[PDB]
């Protein structure tokens, strides 16, 4: 079988291990706790000296300066239906404390440490009474580094992949949880992992042993549309191509263009296939949309070894000097052969009442007179204990001062509209990601079982198509002016239940660009260095009327274009959603 | 209809020196995705460095 | 100090259950504490937390 | 774009200036880093006795 | 809401119109009819 090999692919990270696959934290954990792999005689102190976050976390204002706030695009495109009131639906996002710091926890993925096991809400239908349509978006998790590794192409958010490859609600013993709440296995499923014990145990807890499952394998639904080969029985008819270009028309020898096919067949899958592994039937849903899944820093690699560069490079190696002020005063103060007096302490010898300070100054015992020197002074004066004394403290500082300041840049800029962009921040612009583009693209979920009045309440399209006449209401009395009445005109109703493809839809998503908000941000007036807008005119008194109504997000502000009845209706631009208007005079 | 493809000049374009200079694709013709009205776009990833 | 968290935790709109560890410490003249409800014995002596 | 001598293709990166004045850093932390286990904060003499 | 005011609260109805249109955050009113 052709699969005899997906071992290889994913975790490959394993085989590699001789030397570099230990270095993901390698980038990260140099910095927290311990530091130094070299051994090489040196003494205890350590790891209070670090000094590495406060640029990391700095960064996280540097995040978001734009607003990075639109959504929904308007314009005209397309049939007269929902549009009017915008959203009617969804203000969602706004809702849930988590859901707008959710972009504000996605601006952490780009910079910060590795990436987790991922989990939302434990996964799907658990909150949110609702029309199934869509509920609010994903969640994001804390740390869990260094456990996986994932290789197929895994840049950017451009790729189509194997759905779904693996997700875990991880390494908690609640934690298995109530994804076993669909149905109950034993609870349990206990693989059994492998790491570089190195036969050393300073420490204890070896778990691990949790869920790793797999969704699906190869090759979903082809479109490949194929009519040939009606003579001969059909024999092997199944084909797929890349252009329609040159083959035209060869309906001559042929029927036209009416089928319908079979998206549901049986296909052979084999998916992880552990040797002892189990039946594991029917984990899915309706195939579709499950949007769980990240987007990833950007960069070239050399080798098949993954390529991150963070900020530590410089910070791990110009600091010893910082500590070599430590490194001398640790030992230097732990000999302390205790500095002793000489040249009269020929005395010396051991006594007691010596130590205590002797308030009694004169220790008035000693002598001068020695066995023969010869002649000239002699003079132990020399070096016995002196201190650090380095000579060249002035200018290091700045030099380390240069490097790490070389390292902390980052848009160094001045005032006005010099800009806070940078590419990290430019990620921060389709951090939108998995939540909008799986239901905007592939929309099926959901309930919407609703036409012409459910369908089946279809008699009121009942009108004229009998042969004699009903219809023409009477002229214009206040009889009957009620919605919803049928007096001549036919429905197309609305769309099918969606199939996925349909055009002049898409009406909403990110405008990105000009910071510029739903109401008259930038496009009003702007922020940068000005005063005094108003110009004159006649007609610019009341097309400035027409300028600063502004929000819909507020609580009176349907009295607004309520207010816009009076002898004021001699403007003409009135078109609210009122149903009726033509009221007074 | 969408913003990927302006972020998407990314390592690759800017970069003639540290790597690989960037690149550019056009929608390989008539993908069946979306055949309805004019201008339907998107956009992939400019080729790896190589050295 | 020594109270420490282990159920689950980090949705607020309560997908799991929660408040694992409730407890109300250092009352030796507070003896009000669920006196005013019910107290007769006081026979519990459990172990819990002491290091 | 850059207009060039001869042959074949190369244009360089607009800064090739990194190497000069950036070794001589790591010469500074070199002579000494060799030097530290030479110089290790050690024993005065001879009229001590201790030997 | 202050100490002594009508005013900041809705005290309109009529105020200066024609007729017929108010539709306010406060009752009924309408004076004579």
Known sequence: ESILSRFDADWTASDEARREAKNDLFFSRVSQWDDWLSQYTTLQYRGQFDVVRPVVRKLVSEMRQNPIDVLYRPKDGARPDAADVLMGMYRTDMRHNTAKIAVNIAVREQIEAGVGAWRLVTDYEDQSPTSNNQVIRREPIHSACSHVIWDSNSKLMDKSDARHCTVIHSMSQNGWEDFAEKYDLDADDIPSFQNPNDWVFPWLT???????????????????????????????????????????DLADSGFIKIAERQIKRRRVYKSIITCTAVLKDKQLIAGEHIPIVPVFGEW??????????????????????????????????????????????????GFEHMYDGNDDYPYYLLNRTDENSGDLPTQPLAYYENPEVPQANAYMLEAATSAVKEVATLGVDTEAVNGGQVAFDTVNQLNMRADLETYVFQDNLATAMRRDGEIYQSIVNDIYDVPRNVTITLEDGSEKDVQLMAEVVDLATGEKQVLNDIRGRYECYTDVGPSFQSMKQQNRAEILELLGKTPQGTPEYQLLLLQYFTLLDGKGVEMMRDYANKQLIQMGVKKPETPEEQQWL
């Open 206 to 248: 070896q778990d691990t042993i949790q869920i790793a499952e797999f969704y699906e394998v190869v090759e979903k639904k082809e479109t490949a549309f194929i009519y040939q080969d009606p003579v001969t029985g059909e024999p092997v008819s199944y084909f797929k191509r890349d252009i329609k270009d040159v083959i035209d």
């Open 300 to 349: 070239g690699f050399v080798e098949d070894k993954e390529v991150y560069e963070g900020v530590v490079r410089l910070t791990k190696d110009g600091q010893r000097l910082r500590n070599m002020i430590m490194s001398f005063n640790a030992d230097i103060v732990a000999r302390t052969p205790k500095k002793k007096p000489f040249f009269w302490p020929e005395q010396i010898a």
